[PDB]
């Protein structure tokens, strides 16, 4: 670490290019409106919330950027990608309002979006599709999200797809938020990939929601120590211009020592105090430092201020950071939390309008008046001039991408629709599909295959030699190999899955990984991707509780689909056959990057198990996209049941159908359920509508237009709820569901499928049991059945094992 | 960064205390049995999996620790807490077998656990409660969890609970693994908390499963750079003893430049080539270094090894780490992957046998024999001697704590069972119940309240001035403040929730944070938590999609219960009243920490909305713990319905009941549902048993005993699946479910509750719908109802909004 002083000494600091006095007036009307916006919200007394303190402290930092740095979207690129801290959004609204892009009515509807003319509390692209771009309130996601976005931009240039060199990625973070493991856990990557197009701006006010991030330490020192050692270039914006005369005449060099030794704890105690106190408790520490201020007045000393509130110091940091290459840069801005507000850390607001000199009489205030700037005024001219010099206004978002893509037709995957020679997996089918896509002239170089190291476990090697591994195995490599780091992989996937919006360059990512480590591990990011309108494919290989048989407890996935069905714009599929993988991928491609431009992303669970892949039944394509279709019906004069299966378990459900036919003369309808989740959501959409339209003609759930009323049994390699979620919509009296509830364990596939009461053996018992409960057959048949299949009816429930 | 050579010179290397030759014999047999286990497992041809290369490259490192460092559980403490590298498990099994703790039959049931006598693939306490302690196969969790396990032990000490000063926490990591954000993301905590009881061990064999961690770089300099910057004491174990004499004779330093300049990728091409090649590529770069090896033989040169394989160098690292105070230490051990595996990376097996002087004859080799050291042998004597000199063998686990806690009875929570004078929230109820627990002599100090900065939000302040905050606000502080860091908080909560087994000292933690950032954000730690048999409370505050109304998209939780019902040993609850949290909390305290010692943890979602809290009805306890109880019955002619609700929505269904009665004559049974998930499990369990017992009278699920056949309506502040999971068990032909499916947004509780279609008016419309559908009342009534209640029947589905 370096001395507790600015990185840029005054004799190396560029001359401030802007109108200081005019920017002051401008920013000040913004702090005010930002403040009016929130108070106005409070009066409503409807528990709306909203912050002011976080913004007053960083306002100047953003102001300098908005005045001399932030490039907005333009003809050549998407501009700088700014990850605005989520709690300073009213300040953005404030300036946005000044720039004339938000109405006053909208300011008043702060945190009241339901009716359509409001604004979200925080950056939420889903809710404000043309304004916000990057979801940041969930602390920690912003930092790592910006790192892989800056890396994705470099990716784009290196690949020759788009020159993104004029774009800079700004990640705006609080110091408190830097404790989230995701905040620094990936900063080493900024060095490996040399992201000199990335700048972390850390607002160092020293506190969280209850005191200094580290009271008896020095957060700036901690941040400087770890980032420096991570290879980043760190710039400290510590003190305002009032300390330069002081630091200059301190020949003893004792002031610096003093600043070095004071812990974040005393600095906070100083600012809640006053000049005299500081003269005594800080300068008063050494004779040499009491003499620096020896002739100053207590007031003057109080005027001393931190770097993060001096445009000149703030400006030098961003300028310097700008001309830096080979590595990312972090700016540690030293600031005062709750700046200008003072008192509390109705009328008493005039204090701020006094601190920043707001043009409002002590009269026209009880109304919380929004301040503006009419065309022709000095402030309005300067406001827009600086923004125009910098290509426009931000934040801003473009909902759709402009170009038309020449997606491959399903016929193009016609090989995947035929019976397959050898026995393969849904993963191999998946890899083959992506290969078909790689033959398409239009989308081949737009695909972004992304793996978390196990290209081995997913048969992606055969693709290394064809499209290469991105490695700025050179900088033209198409595949993004992120290693053991699912969060980083996900951020890359998200940068790619949203390139269509950010840089009007649709890219189509396919990120394959051990399904277990999907939503469970990077879940908050997946929810945020939904928020950012991500359009990509999340491929969860080695899925299913019983299919990744040997790995066990921490790898056996029989619940990922339950987590994904929580994300509204995520479409989930658990396909059993390659022709199903092919149809689903084509449809997804069509819906997301085709004319439709539907905002939704795909999740497809694939398998590491090989078996017979039959040819796609003529006319099945639509049923596959909807979630279900009948494979066949086997005859049987002694009875009839319906059998449903998905993923790797369908074949065992078919194995059952056959058994019931031959051993008990019970016929069946065999159904392939590619997506229980979609069927459920459809089921829910039909009943929601039907309930609100009592007199109108009802909507029958797709699943009820495919199933009849004979008794049913369904089994999947996922917990029962996965198949049970469609109960309400199934048109049959009896619906039994087998599942893999319970922690996973190591064994042969055979052994696990019996342990989890999901194989043919259990499907037949279940089927027979339903016949029995309705006098169609003697219960003893069910009993003799449990006996014949080696089924221990009294072992402990798999959930408890 | 320091020169690419050992941190501890030979002149500072202490004498090696063990018998080198005798430790090599023992290790080699260990090496042999681990290989035999996997190979034998392969033969079954059941795709069981398992590793070898992983262990092969780090055995000496673990070996030095088992002979001279690892402390086993004893009477004073829980010994050293070792987070063994998941994939080196066959090796840990290999040793335990030789120490006579695991049988040959068990070793043959490697990865075949279903039937009772096998061994898990990886460290899984739930699958081997007496052997394993800490789940580590999910990369990145072990290191962070360990940093916090070390902190927790400091806490335990500081609080006067247990002298843990002799326990050392070892985290065994792969260089590939350090890319997980969670891996380095929390390292400054170890510096802040001066955790000199923590040691990170990083097997740096440069090769990640799919390739290099950095072909073009030097991952060792990366780790070092960043851990040093974080404040850690770094010890690099680069080279073996053979070089010392070399590094000395080079009074020119070139061999140091040569060492420093050479890049990982390069260093790899070596290991796999031959003598000359080295003395030609490496020592062949400078006629000052190339001279150092002028005598040597192309094979004398090629024998130079890396420090990570040399016992002497490994001991020094582990001795200096043990001596260090005031910061943690990370040992970067340089090794060679698949060490000595010759060919591959009965000829194969024949190579190792010879390569390690494995006492197996050509006559037994083809039998893939396991080696044992008879009692009386020199090997058997020294192996057990070294363990006894260290308190026993490890890993080992104590499934139950031994002491008896005198738990507060339900009556002790008396005031929370009565009607509340003041309107409060289920969160306040939680704080109050926590206060009751703080008045119980027995557990008061065994409690560990955990929070993620946000205290004020959960009105946790009163306790701060009451039991203080842990900050070595003093070292005797009880509440653990982890700041904006869910992951860290959860690890802390994990250390505390498994203290009972690791230190035979029950500690009862209550972690409250924003429900949204729970499972969604740390889900993989939560699953790992179930594997670790954690017994504790996770309090999901500010929950319910519509209730944290102003925060919007990334804060509104209407799905965490969906995420928590995937964890088998997690008991979730969504209570509506204070009397319910009281009953729930007491029941979990009793179950987890009473004589039952059930291996389960709790997840209770609490609200931030105050409202009238009625008194608990008499005899309602059981139902509250089971998941449902009829709150009350509203008589009425014209019709009968059942109304179910949970969390903050129950209050609105009860308004919906009054309105149904008053305005439509429709009578009803109103049920408070404290846990839809538990009832659901109860339903699946009865259904599971009924199918497996065809000749028995169908057992009836509890919810079905509680309700009747009347058309039912359920509404909750969570997506529809929450109350729908029990459909199969509700004994009414009509069961219509309301829920908050869809992305959250900022608005008033009321507007949101109307937007998500869950408030009073929708409960009524839905109820009337079912009365029409049936036939009982004119469908025009449900038409007017829609009109009367200002219900927009044609607005978008909240799931799509």
Swiss-Prot record, chains A, B:
It catalyses: N(6)-[(R)-lipoyl]-L-lysyl-[protein] + pyruvate + H(+) = N(6)-[(R)-S(8)-acetyldihydrolipoyl]-L-lysyl-[protein] + CO2. InterPro entries: PDC_E1_N, PDH/Transketolase, PDH_E1, PDH_E1_M, THDP-binding, Transketo_C/PFOR_II, Transketolase-like_C_2, Transketolase_N. This is Pyruvate dehydrogenase E1 component. One of its GO terms (molecular function) is molecular adaptor activity. One of its GO terms (biological process) is pyruvate catabolic process. It comes from the Bacteria. Keywords: Acetylation, Magnesium, Metal-binding, Oxidoreductase, Pyruvate, Thiamine pyrophosphate. The modification N6-acetyllysine is found at residue 630. Mg(2+) binds at residues 175, 205, 207. One of its GO terms (cellular component) is pyruvate dehydrogenase complex. Component of the pyruvate dehydrogenase (PDH) complex, that catalyzes the overall conversion of pyruvate to acetyl-CoA and CO(2). Its EC number is 1.2.4.1. Its cofactor is Mg(2+); thiamine diphosphate. NCBIfam families: aceE. Homodimer. Part of the PDH complex, consisting of multiple copies of pyruvate dehydrogenase (E1), dihydrolipoamide acetyltransferase (E2) and lipoamide dehydrogenase (E3). In pull-down experiments interacts with CedA.
């Amino acid at each position: 670490i370096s001395n507790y002083i600015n990185t840029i000494p005054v004799e190396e600091q560029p001359e401030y290019p802007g109108n200081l006095e005019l920017e002051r007036r401008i920013r000040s009307a913004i702090r005010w409106n930002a403040i009016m916006t929130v108070l106005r919200a409070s009066k409503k007394d409807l528990e709306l919330g909203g912050h002011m303190a976080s913004f007053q402290s960083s306002a100047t930092i953003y102001d300098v950027c908005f005045n001399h740095f932030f490039r907005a979207r333009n003809e050549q690129d998407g501009g700088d990608l700014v990850y605005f801290q989520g709690h300073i959004s009213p300040g953005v609204y404030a300036r946005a309002f000044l720039e004339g892009r938000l109405t006053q009515e909208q300011l008043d509807n702060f945190r009241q979006e339901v009716h359509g003319n409001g604004l979200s509390s925080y950056p939420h692209p889903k809710l404000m599709p043309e304004f916000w771009q990057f979801p940041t309130v969930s602390m920690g996601l912003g930092p790592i999200g910006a790192i892989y976005q800056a890396k994705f931009l470099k990716y784009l240039e290196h690949r020759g797809l788009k020159d993104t060199s004029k774009q800079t990625v700004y990640a705006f973070l609080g110091d408190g938020e830097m404790d989230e493991p995701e905040s620094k856990g990936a900063i080493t990557i900024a060095t490996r990939e040399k992201l000199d197009n990335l700048v972390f701006v850390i607002n160092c006010n020293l506190q969280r929601l209850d005191g200094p991030v580290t009271g008896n330490g020095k957060i700036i020192n901690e941040l400087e120590g770890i980032f420096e050692g991570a290879g980043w270039n760190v710039i400290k914006v510590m003190w305002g211009s009032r300390w330069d005369e002081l630091l200059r005449k301190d020949t003893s060099g004792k002031l610096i020592q003093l600043m070095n030794e004071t812990v974040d704890g005393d600095y906070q105690t100083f600012k809640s105090k006053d000049g005299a106190y500081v003269r005594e408790h800080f300068f008063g520490k050494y004779p040499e430092t009491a003499a620096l201020v020896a002739d100053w007045t207590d007031e003057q000393i109080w005027a001393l201020n931190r770097g993060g509130h001096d445009p000149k110091k703030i400006y030098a940091a961003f300028k310097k950071a700008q001309e830096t290459k080979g590595k990312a840069t972090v700016i540690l801005a030293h600031t005062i939390k709750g700046y200008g507000m003072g008192d509390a850390a109705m009328d008493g607001v005039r204090h701020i309008r006094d601190r920043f000199n707001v043009p409002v009489s002590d009269a026209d205030i009880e109304k919380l008046p929004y301040i503006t700037f009419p065309e022709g005024s000095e402030e309005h001219t300067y406001l827009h001039a600086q923004r125009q010099k910098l290509h426009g206004y931000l934040p801003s978002r473009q909902p759709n991408f402009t170009e038309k893509l020449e997606l491959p037709s399903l016929q193009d995957f016609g090989a995947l629709l035929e019976e397959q020679s050898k026995e393969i997996s849904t993963t191999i089918a998946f890899v083959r599909a992506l290969n078909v896509m790689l033959k398409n002239k239009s989308i081949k170089d737009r695909l972004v295959p992304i793996i978390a190291d196990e290209a081995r476990t997913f048969g992606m090697e055969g693709l290394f030699r064809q499209i290469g591994i991105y490695s700025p195995e050179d900088e033209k490599g198409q595949i993004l190999q992120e290693g053991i780091n699912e969060l980083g992989a996900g951020c890359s996937w998200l940068a790619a899955a949203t390139s269509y919006s950010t840089n009007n360059l649709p890219m189509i990512p396919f990120y394959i990984y051990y399904s277990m480590f999907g939503f469970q591990r990077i879940g908050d990011l997946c929810w945020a991707a939904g928020d950012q309108q991500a359009r990509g494919f999340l491929i969860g290989g080695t899925s299913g509780r019983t299919t990744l048989n040997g790995e066990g407890l921490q790898h056996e996935d029989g619940h990922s689909h339950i987590q994904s069905l929580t994300i509204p714009n995520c479409i989930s599929y658990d396909p059993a056959y390659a022709y199903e993988v092919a149809v689903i991928m084509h449809d997804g491609l069509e819906r997301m990057y085709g004319e439709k431009q539907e905002n939704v992303y795909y999740y497809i669970t694939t398998l590491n198990e090989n078996y017979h892949m039959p040819a796609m039944p003529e006319g099945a394509e639509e049923g596959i996209r909807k979630g279900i279709y009948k494979l066949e019906t086997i005859e049987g004069s002694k009875g009839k049941v319906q059998l449903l299966g998905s993923g790797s378990i369908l074949r065992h459900v078919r194995e059952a159908a056959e058994i019931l036919a031959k051993d008990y003369g019970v016929g069946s309808d065999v159904y392939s359920v590619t997506s229980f989740t979609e069927l459920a959501r459809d089921g829910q959409d039909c009943e929601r509508w039907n309930m609100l339209h009592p007199l109108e003609t009802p909507r029958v759930p797709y699943i009820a237009q495919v199933m009849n009323d004979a008794p049913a049994v369904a089994s999947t390699d996922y917990m029962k709820l996965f198949a049970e979620q469609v109960r309400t919509y199934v048109p049959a009296d009896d619906y039994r569901v087998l599942g893999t509830d319970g922690f996973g364990r190591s064994d042969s596939r055979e052994n696990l499928r019996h342990h989890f009461e999901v194989d043919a053996s259990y499907v037949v018992v279940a089927a027979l049991g339903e016949l029995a409960k309705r006098g169609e057959i003697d219960k003893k048949v069910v009993a003799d059945a449990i006996a014949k299949f080696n089924i221990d009816a009294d072992k402990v429930n798999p959930r408890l094992a």
